[PDB]
Symmetry: T
Subunit: 118 residues, 12 copies
Amino acid sequence: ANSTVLSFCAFAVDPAKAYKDYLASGGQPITNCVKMLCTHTGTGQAITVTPEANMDQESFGGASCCLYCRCHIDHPNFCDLKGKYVQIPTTCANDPVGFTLRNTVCTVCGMWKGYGCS
Amino acid sequence: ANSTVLSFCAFAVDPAKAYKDYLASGGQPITNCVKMLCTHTGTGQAITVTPEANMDQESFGGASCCLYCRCHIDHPNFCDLKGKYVQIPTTCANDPVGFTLRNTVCTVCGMWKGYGCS
Amino acid sequence: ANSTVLSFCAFAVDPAKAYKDYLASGGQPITNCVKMLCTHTGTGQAITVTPEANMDQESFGGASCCLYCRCHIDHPNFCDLKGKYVQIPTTCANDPVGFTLRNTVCTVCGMWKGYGCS
Amino acid sequence: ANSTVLSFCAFAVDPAKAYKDYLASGGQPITNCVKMLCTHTGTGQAITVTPEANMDQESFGGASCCLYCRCHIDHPNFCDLKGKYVQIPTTCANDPVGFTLRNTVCTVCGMWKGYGCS
Amino acid sequence: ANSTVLSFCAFAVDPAKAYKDYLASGGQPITNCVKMLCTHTGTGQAITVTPEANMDQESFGGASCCLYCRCHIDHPNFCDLKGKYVQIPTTCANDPVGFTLRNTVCTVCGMWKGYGCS
Amino acid sequence: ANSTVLSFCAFAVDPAKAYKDYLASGGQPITNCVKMLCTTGTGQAITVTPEANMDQESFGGASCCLYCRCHIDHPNFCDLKGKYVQIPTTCANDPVGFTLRNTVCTVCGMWKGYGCS
Amino acid sequence: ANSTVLSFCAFAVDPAKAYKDYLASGGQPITNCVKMLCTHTGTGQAITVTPEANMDQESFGGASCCLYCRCHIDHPNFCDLKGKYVQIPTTCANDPVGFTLRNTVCTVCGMWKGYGCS
Amino acid sequence: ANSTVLSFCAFAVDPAKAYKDYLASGGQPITNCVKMLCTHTGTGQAITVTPEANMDQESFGGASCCLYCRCHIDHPNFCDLKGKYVQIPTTCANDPVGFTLRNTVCTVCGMWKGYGCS
Amino acid sequence: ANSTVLSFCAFAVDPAKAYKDYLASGGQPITNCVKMLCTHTGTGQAITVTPEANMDQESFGGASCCLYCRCHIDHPNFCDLKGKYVQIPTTCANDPVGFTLRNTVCTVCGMWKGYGCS
Amino acid sequence: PANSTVLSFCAFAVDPAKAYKDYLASGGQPITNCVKMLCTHTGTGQAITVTPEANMDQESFGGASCCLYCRCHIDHPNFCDLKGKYVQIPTTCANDPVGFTLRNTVCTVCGMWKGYGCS
Amino acid sequence: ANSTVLSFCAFAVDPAKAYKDYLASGGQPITNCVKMLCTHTGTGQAITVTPEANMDQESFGGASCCLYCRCHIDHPNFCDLKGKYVQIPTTCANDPVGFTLRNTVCTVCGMWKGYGCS
Amino acid sequence: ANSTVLSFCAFAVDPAKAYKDYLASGGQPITNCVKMLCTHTGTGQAITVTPEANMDQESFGGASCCLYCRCHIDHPNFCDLKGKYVQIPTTCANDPVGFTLRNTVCTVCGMWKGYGCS
Ligand SMILES: [Zn+2]
Ligand SMILES: [Zn+2]
Ligand SMILES: [Zn+2]
Ligand SMILES: [Zn+2]
Ligand SMILES: [Zn+2]
Ligand SMILES: [Zn+2]
Ligand SMILES: [Zn+2]
Ligand SMILES: [Zn+2]
Ligand SMILES: [Zn+2]
Ligand SMILES: [Zn+2]
Ligand SMILES: [Zn+2]
Ligand SMILES: [Zn+2]
Ligand SMILES: [Zn+2]
Ligand SMILES: [Zn+2]
Ligand SMILES: [Zn+2]
Ligand SMILES: [Zn+2]
Ligand SMILES: [Zn+2]
Ligand SMILES: [Zn+2]
Ligand SMILES: [Zn+2]
Ligand SMILES: [Zn+2]
Ligand SMILES: [Zn+2]
Ligand SMILES: [Zn+2]
Ligand SMILES: [Zn+2]
Ligand SMILES: [Zn+2]
């Protein structure tokens, strides 16, 4: 499952673009990301030092949601997810890996642009 | 709260001993360890690369449960818990930090001695 | 007073949140941030490689205004302030440590959002 | 040649400002940045893992356009250009070094503010 | 076939478990481990600094037997095999990679538990 | 395509031999090597700036390195990363295999058999 | 003295075995191992972060008791003695270096098997 | 008590001056430094690779006497005490940590200026 | 002006002697060192972890006054100025870079020999 | 131990390799305990490889065990070109693997030992 | 004259080519490379761990003769001359920095192609 | 001879003391230190970045004279001699290794105390 898609991305000259193209081909999103059993009364910001999911999110272990960490390859950012917790809207939690790649954290409020920001 | 206890152990010449005496004087165990949301159908092994809590255990982020990582000091063992998951017998889950300090992982079964092993 | 506050924040699972709660409870801001003797005719940008205060700011050595450097713990940002100089509005210079935690540098003009930006 | 200007900025306490003042005085832009032969135009993003030049952009080797790398001095930002490819609008491709110092990559779309963004 | 299996385990969240599941599904053991040509007059201990095979064991190059080295990923133990020699009972020498993942070295006598120990 | 072949060699005990047998079995050469836009250079094989002469193409070094492309350790560190490799245009369809197959002349710095002496 | 024995073992392809064979041949044990004052009746555990000698043991400096540290060669284990304190039964303290090579620490109670354990 | 003082010094902008002020306020010296047992008196040099206490001194493990190692914070000077032994005049051995901070080793004879030197 | 002098010294086989010869030929001292705004109630010691200028000294940022840091080359002492503060007698504060190369800190009182010492 | 004396002698010499050469010149016994590989012996025959490559006229040895610097625990002057790889040595010279690699050259073209397999 | 020429090559995109061109225009070779006083009973090989000049060569300290070390810039090759001795034919000892750039060491005999080889 | 002395000192718990007793018992000083070819019109200072021998000294490559570097063991002091040049009075140049162990460089004038100082 994941090994097939991850192997495909790991050796592509652009891993993120390969995952994107893969998904656009109807590919199955990477699974096995780890979720936190949290309060859901957090700030709701995107990437935090402790789980911060609010009622509309899930909190995942950062490294388990990072394409480069999962492909065991060098990062192009080292890694701003590893060791942190990533808050993902529940309606998008079916693809934690793809969500951080496709979205942007607001430099001002710390929340995902389009899902919490302003 | 945790800062007082952590501060007290962090500067002690033997942090694990300082935490032990603190608990022996009736101190509240360290909190805010990070608990994982898992299916409880794992191997039940003590320290693993993915959450492995069985029916009688809770899975926690390793660094969250390490006295040394929580105290921000050097390790004595780098760290055997960081980046991994620690399964704690549920009835001892009120003190994950203290549990790993007091118990031994069986070299054969990989389970905690006295808790799930042999 | 500084050691008491820094100790409390250093061991909290979320140091920035601890200082913020601490200030909201009326705690005194961290002092002993080192100020620069400079022209005060500089660009006025927020974080620079040489002092750049304009007439409405004070310049401080970066590491001295960084909660993580002051606390001697790892950074959640490595460190964007160490080795640099931070310009802080003079009306907010009584809490350089909290000021940079609460505010945002504009990625376009390099000045603090709300204090100089645009 | 490039050595005269590079030497002048290398030892300045603010290398970027020195290059700025140099150009403001009519100095000739640093040359010999390397160009990538992008044959099937790319995403147009400012800084990427593989050449991505639009119809209206040129792709340069990241390190060749970096003032810090070209001056062989520590960066202030490691280096966010090294190992990557920088796409510069063809009309400003005569000063790749100065271009990245003067402009901002949009955090949302990844294109240069004022050149490609939105 | 070796690259297919290694690739499968390399990207699995638990590589050891992935290899176990593959062997249980009747998968063929990883080959190309390196063997020592020695006089089998050794102590017979499990992991040693020089080849130590007795008559009923084969000595292998440790790294060639390590799933993590063969997969080129980080180790979870670092590597206790790399640079050393692993003695495997002749009747289990058809799967050196899986053998060390499934068995235990006795802390007392240094021989494999269940094969030689006590 | 590239991912399939690179995965195959990345896990082999001898990555270079694996790419050799793949090519020999008719496999397609690894593509996506980064080509440099350049001029009239020395034509030397591995340089610090692009140096293709008229019978060559200049490629970004790591792009053409099997080990860098496979993200595994080198056996050579890497003599291509950060440099530029000039490859005879007649062979520029397999830059990864070319450097694996050929030798740089220690004396003139050009490829043995392609420019040397 | 100690230099002759140490050089002999330092260059052996198996230093531990060389020291063992040297001792079996009548050789004098390595001396000059450093001892420290235990400031309470210690736990009596074998290897600790501070001196833990029981009334039947003596506490030695770990590195001093390490054949590999003493021989200035890379370890095989990195070093699990260095920086710690090693407790040796008083009547066996004429050979601290050999004692730790010969004995096993119980992973359960942390005392030497045969001298304290269970 | 030790944790209280070390915590106060650890977070002060000048750890050494904080300790000096704490002592001048009548505070009690830091305890638990580790004392060496010598069978013979040594050279009496201040900082040595093996214990060297003469008749007027006591030898201590260097790190245990280092304010920075004890506070677990970065050194100012890496650390000239760690891994070596410090000889402290007996009349001042009630405060080994404060002693090395207040005194100077003679560059010529290697003993403490004012105690032993010349 | 500073770039030209620093350039000249940085490539010399003996950088300090080059600056010295440059000054003796009447060259202008290197400028742009950073100065601290402090109370001037300090200890007056030469090199300190926080500014310690007394009434007749200026406190400068360490790396700013280091010839090797300014030339971006290795140190022949690591650097004893970087990250610290250097107190320079007021009457010699026109040449901070040269001052520290020509003078000596008293190992005893910590002040500059000939200026403050004894 | 068998090789400790000769290794100690070379380890502290200003030129370890020259010290071993002189030692051999004076009739010294070559360094032993190099580890031999059990392999096909139908390999490429090249000198230093990532996997055993002995042909029928060679023996493959573990690199580090054949390296004077690794055996002497001192820094290298060539990290190390043998460590982690395998050395193929002509069967007729296999009595001195540590010395064979110091005295011979690998052809940069064919990868085989100059004088033993090259061109 | 050295600082001017080293400055020019240090910031050039191809340092060795800039030096070659500088010499071809009549530039004076770099001086101040250090020479060894030996008996000249050496093997005459090009780059050795000890001085090995024969009667027709000078032995230079390797780093003094290395363009990159002298220019304080990263190496292209780390550095094969640093810490070693370079034997240069006496007739070319007037340009030791240019000599090693222009010549080749014979892989077989270890001497310079064209000066000693064969 | 050289290897005999160096091996003895290398494994001694105190190398410099071992060499000192060896000399005291009639031992022949370590030879093969490398001598620099110089003008002998230098400053005569003790340890310099370039050869600085005056007419009464010899200049030697630093590492060649350092007991720790010659023994291949960790230093106590990385190394202050490595990379530099040591000036030794010609009358003592028969034992450069021991001379630097026995003597002291004046912190003020930089010459050896007793041989050049004041
Ligand atoms: Zn990651
Ligand atoms: Zn926002
Ligand atoms: Zn930890
Ligand atoms: Zn068990
Ligand atoms: Zn910081
Ligand atoms: Zn703005
Ligand atoms: Zn850069
Ligand atoms: Zn945009
Ligand atoms: Zn491994
Ligand atoms: Zn057993
Ligand atoms: Zn590569
Ligand atoms: Zn050629
Ligand atoms: Zn050790
Ligand atoms: Zn026990
Ligand atoms: Zn310390
Ligand atoms: Zn004295
Ligand atoms: Zn400096
Ligand atoms: Zn003084
Ligand atoms: Zn080696
Ligand atoms: Zn050949
Ligand atoms: Zn160099
Ligand atoms: Zn030749
Ligand atoms: Zn040294
Ligand atoms: Zn003097």
